Amino acid sequence: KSRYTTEFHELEKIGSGEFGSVFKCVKRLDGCIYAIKRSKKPLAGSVDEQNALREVYAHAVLGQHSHVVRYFSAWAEDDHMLIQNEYCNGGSLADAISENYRIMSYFKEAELKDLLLQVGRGLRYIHSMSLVHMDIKPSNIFISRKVMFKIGDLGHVTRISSPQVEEGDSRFLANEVLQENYTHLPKADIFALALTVVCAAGAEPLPRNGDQWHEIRQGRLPRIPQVLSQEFTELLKVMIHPDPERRPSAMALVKHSVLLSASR
Numbered sequence: 716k717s718r719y720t721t722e723f724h725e726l727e728k729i730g731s732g733e734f735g736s737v738f739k740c741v742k743r744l745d746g747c748i749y750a751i752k753r754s755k756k757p758l759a760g761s762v763d764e765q766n767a768l769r770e771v772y773a774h775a776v777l778g779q780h781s782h783v784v785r786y787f788s789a790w791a792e793d794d795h796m797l798i799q800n801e802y803c804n805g806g807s808l809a810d811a812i813s814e815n816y817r818i819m820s821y822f823k824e825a826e827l828k829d830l831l832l833q834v835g836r837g838l839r840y841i842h843s844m845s846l847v848h849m850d851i852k853p854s855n856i857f858i859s860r861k862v863m864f865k866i867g868d869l870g871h872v873t874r875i876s877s878p879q880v881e882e883g884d885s886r887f888l889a890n891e892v893l894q895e896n897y898t899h900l901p902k903a904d905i906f907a908l909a910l911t912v913v914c915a916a917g918a919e920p921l922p923r924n925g926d927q928w929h930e931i932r933q934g935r936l937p938r939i940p941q942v943l944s945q946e947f948t949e950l951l952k953v954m955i956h957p958d959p960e961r962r963p964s965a966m967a968l969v970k971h972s973v974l975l976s977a978s979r
């Protein structure tokens with residue numbers, strides 16, 4: 716007899732986690748399609764509940780922007796927490812990347828700069844709302860169709876000067892965050908965005924740990940299977956600089972000369 720059951724029709728599963736799943740659903744009264752995550756409700760008062768609620772609070776402030784997915788509603792049922800957000804019809808950036816890997820045709824420089832600029836505009840909004848994302852990666856960027864890239868998955872979002880941080884994907888994690896130096900949190904999103912663009916440019920699967928992981932955190936870009944301009948490659952390289960203060964801010968990124976050609 717639930718709200719979820721009565722107001723929506725499920726069309727297809729689009730996501731799966733440890734204690735939840737995501738469906739593409741049509742809402743019965745308005746006719747429109749939504750992505751609805753349904754997750755097991757955490758125990759009352761726990762730090763898990765506070766974590767889950769930061770995500771609801773994050774969407775409810777961060778969704779006004781064109782490069783963050785819109786939020787529509789969140790509610791608790793008996794044992795479940797639901798979040799109804801915008802459905803992006805083009806899927807994740809990760810699935811596009813996987814397809815591109817198989818066929819040997821990747822995002823070209825002009826598409827990579829458009830990716831960098833659009834997600835950079837989304838981070839710029841996030842950062843000006845006094846928040847950081849903390850988990851930028853291709854599986855958390857979604858595609859609507861020109862192409863529009865939108866940040867989703869707000870489950871690591873925290874305030875910009877937070878003393879406590881749940882770190883995101885190991886493949887995209889800056890070293891300073893791993894060492895618990897949270898002085899420059901916005902520059903973790905910049906570091907992760909750089910390696911997101913490297914993935915899109917056709918790189919091999921990034922390391923989770925080991926020597927190559929440390930190689931990258933020296934400021935070395937992984938091998939990219941295509942010719943990029945030197946100034947674009949150097950923008951990416953400084954975005955993974957070991958000093959986070961040397962990496963550009965999201966405002967400096969969107970105003971960058973290299974990205975002036977991509978500005979719509």
Ligand SMILES: C[C@@H](c1cccs1)c1c(C#N)c2cnc(Nc3cnn(C4CCN(C)CC4)c3)nc2n1C
Nearest residue numbers: 729730737750752784798800801802803806867868
């Ligand atoms: C992170 C999660 C949520 C967090 C909170 C609530 S829901 C979320 C979105 C949001 N927000 C979100 C938005 N759009 C899409 N879109 C999509 C995915 N996969 N597909 C593909 C299906 C197979 N077909 C064949 C080709 C498209 C489309 N997927 C989304 N997912 C997973």
Ligand SMILES: [Cl-]
Nearest residue numbers: 718722723742
């Ligand atoms: Cl509803």
Ligand SMILES: [Cl-]
Nearest residue numbers: 728729730731
């Ligand atoms: Cl799935």
Ligand SMILES: [Cl-]
Nearest residue numbers: 809852853854
């Ligand atoms: Cl990914």
Ligand SMILES: [Cl-]
Nearest residue numbers: 886914920921
């Ligand atoms: Cl990867």
Ligand SMILES: [Cl-]
Nearest residue numbers: 934935936952
């Ligand atoms: Cl390099």
Ligand code: NA
Nearest residue numbers: 766770870871
């Ligand atoms: Na969270």
